[PDB]
Amino acid sequence: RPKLYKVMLLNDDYTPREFVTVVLKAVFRMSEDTGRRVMMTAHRFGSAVVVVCERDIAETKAKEATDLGKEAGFPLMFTTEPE
C-alpha cells in the first residue's frame, strides 16, 4: 500500500501573487479562481495543501512548480510531506 504525499505551497514575501496563481494553473491544472484561493491560503497562513498523490508524482510536481519560480529569480517553494 503506497503512502500518499501532500504537495505543500509555502509562503514568501517576494514571489508575485499572480505568478503563484499561473504556476498553480499550469502545473496542477487549477482554474483562475481555485488558483487565487489556494495561493491566498498560503499567503495568510504560511502554507497550503495543493494536492495529495503518490510520492514520486508529488516530488515531480513540487520540483517543476518550484523550478518555475526559481529560474524566474523567485524563492517560490513547493515541498512534499507525508500524511
Ligand SMILES: NC(=O)[C@@H](N)Cc1ccc(O)cc1
Ligand atoms: N508577493 C507576496 O506578497 C507573496 N506573499 C505572495 C505569495 C502567496 C503565496 C505563496 O505561496 C507565495 C507568495
